[PDB]
Design a protein around this ligand. Structure first.
Ligand SMILES: [Zn+2]
Length: 25
């Protein structure tokens, strides 16, 4: 999830989808 994102910040508007799209793997 964005809250536990590993990448250098992804959610630029509180959007897990935009984040998990690459993260969580
Ligand atoms: Zn991320």
């Amino acid at each position: 999830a964005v809250s536990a994102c590993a990448l250098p910040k992804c959610a630029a508007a509180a959007n897990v989808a935009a984040h998990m799209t690459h993260c969580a793997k």
